[PDB]
Each structure stands twice: as C-alpha cells, then as structure tokens.
Amino acid sequence: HEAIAKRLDACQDQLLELYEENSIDIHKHIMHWKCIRLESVLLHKAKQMGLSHIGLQVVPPLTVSETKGHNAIEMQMHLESLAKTQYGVEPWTLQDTSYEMWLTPPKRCFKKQGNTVEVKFDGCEDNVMEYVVWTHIYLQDNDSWVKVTSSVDAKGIYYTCGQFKTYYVNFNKEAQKYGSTNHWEVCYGSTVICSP
Ligand SMILES: Cc1ccc2c(c1)C(=O)[C@]1(O[C@@H](c3ccc(Cl)c(Cl)c3)[C@@H](C(=O)Nc3ccc(-c4csnn4)cc3)[C@H]1C(=O)O)C2=O
Ligand SMILES: Cc1ccc2c(c1)C(=O)[C@]1(O[C@@H](c3ccc(Cl)c(Cl)c3)[C@@H](C(=O)Nc3ccc(-c4csnn4)cc3)[C@H]1C(=O)O)C2=O
Predict the structure, then answer these.
(1) Residue ranges of the domains in the chain?
(2) Are the beta carbons of 45 and 101 closer than 8 angstroms?
C-alpha cells in the first residue's frame, strides 16, 4: 500500500460531497454509509501499516475504525431492507437515516416528523422537560416493515401496533429523575393532560 492517502482523501472528499448534497433519496444515503465503511477500512489499514497521521489527520485506534465500520454495515443493511418496500420511495433525509437517530427512542426503528412534548413536573415552571413524539415510525419484521403512529397520554409517549401500545418514553421514570412528586402536566399541540 502507498496510495492509501491519495485514496483516503478522495473518500473523505466524497463524504463531504454526500453531506453537502442534502438529498432526500434513500439510495444516496445507502451509498453514503458504504463510503463510511470505505473510510474506516482505509483508516483501519493505515493503523496496521503503523502510520500515525495522514496529512494533519490523526489515524484512529483499530477498535474505533472497527466500530464505525460495524455501525455503517448495520445502517446500510437496514436501509437497503427498507428500500425494498413501498416506504423506500418516501423522502428520507440524511438525518432520518443517521446512526444518531437510529439509537434515539424508539431505538432501532426508523422515524420521521417529530413533534415536541413538554412535561412540567410538580407544577414548577423551571421543571420542564422536552420530548419527541414521532408521527411516523417504521418497525422491522424479519425483512418486512410496518408503518405505525404515536400518541400521548398521562403515562407517556407510545406507538400502536395492532392492540399493543409500546411506550418509548415513560413519564413515571422521568419523574423519579427530575421531580419529587408523582404529579405532572403534559403538553403537546393544544392538548394538556395531567397525571392522576
Ligand atoms: C465535521 C464533523 C464534525 C463532527 C463529527 C464528525 C464530522 C463525525 O464524523 C463524527 O460523527 C461520529 C460518528 C460517525 C459515524 C459513525 Cl458510524 C458513528 Cl457511530 C459516529 C463521530 C465518531 O467517529 N464517533 C465515534 C466515537 C467513538 C468510537 C469508538 C468506537 S470503540 N471506541 N470508541 C467510534 C466513533 C465523529 C467522527 O468521526 O469524528 C462527529 O462527531
Ligand atoms: C446517511 C448518513 C451517512 C453517514 C452519516 C450520517 C448519515 C450521519 O448523520 C453521521 O454524521 C455524523 C456527524 C456528526 C456531527 C457533525 Cl457536525 C456532522 Cl457534519 C456529521 C453523525 C451524527 O452525529 N449525525 C447526526 C445526525 C442527526 C442529528 C440530529 C439533528 S436534530 N436531531 N438529531 C445529529 C447528528 C453520523 C450519524 O449518527 O449517522 C454519519 O457519519
């Protein structure tokens, strides 16, 4: 290896290009994740050849490149799976398909159209937490996908699949962390509901 650096700068230049694109095409995002794998494959290689730097850039530990390459594969795979469905032609932003969002509740589900939910604990203006409720959640099933919606009640934020209600934000747990009483007020939209 020798052109490793010339190849890495071309990859990172490409990543910057993909970022700037600000595309809504799920397929560009899949290609973006493939390039993240390429970058980490090259940085991982560079660390093995003993290199410490590549044009001002610091070569990361093998464990870091291994971790990014792994996350990139997971993202790429789930996106391609979702891409084989009626949902894949919908608009998908770079943010909607990030690992960051993937790990945001509900974890390991895709989601879109987030809205704000405020919870005031005890009834003290300075005790207000903000949460997100997603209008569209895509749940995985083997290799098929299901589109569901969210709702809010005195107990928390949840999505409905059939007769099952799954909460991705528990208002009682939140209380034990930012409140002292088991009394709280919830506000989303023009709607308000208080804990009993
Ligand atoms: C301009 C610009 C400005 C800010 C950022 C970037 C670019 C990025 O690419 C960054 O996004 C992250 C990331 C980018 C891509 C992916 Cl896949 C992920 Cl998970 C995060 C991160 C990153 O690499 N996070 C990370 C932290 C710890 C580990 C690790 C593994 S084992 N021990 N530590 C690995 C990655 C970081 C980055 O690559 O520098 C980030 O914060
Ligand atoms: C398809 C595609 C392909 C590769 C990547 C993405 C998307 C990303 O979003 C990633 O960009 C990172 C980043 C990390 C920091 C910087 Cl500054 C830059 Cl440019 C890139 C990082 C990251 O932190 N992104 C991120 C996305 C959304 C939010 C957000 C905004 S409002 N709610 N959530 C925050 C972070 C990471 C990731 O988590 O996926 C990335 O490497």
Answers:
(1) 1-98, 99-196
(2) no
CA of 13 relative to ligand 1 center, distance in Å:
16
CB under 6 Å to ligand 2: residues? Answer: 19, 29, 32-33, 36, 94-95, 97-101
Domains 1-98 and 99-196 share a fold: no
Which ligand has the shortest distance to the CA of 33? Answer: 2
| Residue 43 CB–ligand 1 contact under 6 Å | no
What resolution in angstrom units was achieved for this structure?
2.4
* Experimental technique of record: X-ray
The domain 1-98 is placed in CATH, from the list 1.10.3720.10, 1.10.287.30, 1.20.1250.20, 3.40.50.12780, at: 1.10.287.30
Going from the Cα of 101 to the center of ligand 2, the distance in angstroms, rounded, reads: 8
